[PDB]
From a paper:
We have unraveled structures of the soluble components and the pore assembly of the [name] cytolysin from Y. enterocolitica. The crystal structures show an atypical fold, comprising a head domain reminiscent of ClyA family toxins and pronounced coiled-coil and foot domains unique to the [name] system. In line with our finding that the isolated YaxA and YaxB head domains form spoked oligomers in solution, the YaxB head domain in isolation was sufficient for recruitment to membrane-bound YaxA. Together, our biochemical data support a role for YaxA as the initial membrane-interacting subunit of the toxin, able to bring the lytic effector YaxB to the target cell surface.
The orthologue [name] produced better diffracting crystals than YaxB and thus served as template for molecular replacement phasing (the two proteins share 40% amino acid sequence identity, whereas YaxA shares 18% and 22% sequence identity with [name] and YaxB, respectively). Because our [name] model could be well resolved, missing merely the N-terminal 11 residues, we will utilize these coordinates for most structural analyses throughout the manuscript. All three proteins adopt similarly elongated, α-helical folds composed of a five-helix bundle head domain and a two-helix-coiled-coil stalk, tapering to a narrow turn in the case of YaxA, while connecting to an additional α-helical domain in the case of [name]. For the [name] head domain, Z-scores ranged from 7.4 (soluble-monomeric ClyA, 3.8 Å RMSD) to 13.3 (pore-protomeric ClyA, 2.4 Å RMSD; PDB code 2WCD12). Our monomeric [name] structure, while complete, might hamper a true comparison with the protomeric YaxB unit, since it is derived from a different species. However, it is noteworthy that the foot domain represents the region of highest sequence conservation between Yersinia and Photorhabdus orthologues (60% sequence identity; Supplementary Figure 12b, highlighted in black box), indeed pointing to a common principle of pore formation.
Numbering used by the authors: 12 to 353
Write the structure that this text describes.
Amino acid sequence: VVYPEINVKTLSQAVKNIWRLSHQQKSGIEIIQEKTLRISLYSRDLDEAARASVPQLQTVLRQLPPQDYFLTLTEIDTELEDPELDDETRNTLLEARSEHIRNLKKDVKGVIRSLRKEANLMASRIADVSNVVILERLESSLKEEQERKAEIQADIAQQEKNKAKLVVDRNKIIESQDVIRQYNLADMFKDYIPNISDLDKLDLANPKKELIKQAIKQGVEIAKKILGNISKGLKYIELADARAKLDERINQINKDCDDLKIQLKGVEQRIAGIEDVHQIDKERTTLLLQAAKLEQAWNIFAKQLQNTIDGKIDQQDLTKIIHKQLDFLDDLALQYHSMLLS
Ligand code: NA
Ligand code: NA
């Protein structure tokens, strides 16, 4: 027979993590929010049962060794060897050991009921935490939100790119207005913006010619395309009118990007919430492994003492079984005593 190796820190830390996750998680499903609180509540109850079982079973097992029959049965059986008085000594000593054995069975029956009581209790705790169903179509939900996150991020990226193009198209028209305003082109050329050929004839330095000549050509070409002008010349008021439409469209894109960034926080919070629920299931799996080993240990402990008192009573064998079972509990207490959670 071998006892399970149990880490109660891994058990208790997992219960601690379920509590933390069940309260910060914000997937916004609500029934999941309630079910996660059920798991944390029953998880803490399981942890309480595990912590109480150790000093409970220690108390029960420690009552057996100090009994008189452990020592006196060895003294009876050792003196029940040599040629003795067959009635006065031998018959009487047999009836004395039968009295001791009846008390030994009665005590060992009692500690077995205590071990079974802890096993059945831990089994009820394991049932409570495990029976809460949380992963029904949660892999489906995680896929849905990440798909919605993908197209929102894709929309923001396109919107930002379409805005970036409109920003330069706007800035090209602004540069055209600046050279018109700086050199008073509206004063010379009435109503319509001067052509590229007309700008050459102006009294300007050669670097200044190419400066304004490129500005006008670029801003006019853009403005004409926006107003649907593929025929006539461009007026100054039409240049400002062309900019006004771009400012309206850029402002509209900024508003649309703000609404998308609100939705993006929504999906990211819900994906984070779904990931915490997935983590709660993994923390629950971790603690149940340790919890199942406690149930197993007590049922092993019970049947081990049962087999000692089924047939012939090996007084001194039982003393080893108790001390081995006690050393196992001493270890569990050592873990709880020096436990540092986080
Ligand atoms: Na409780
Ligand atoms: Na129940």
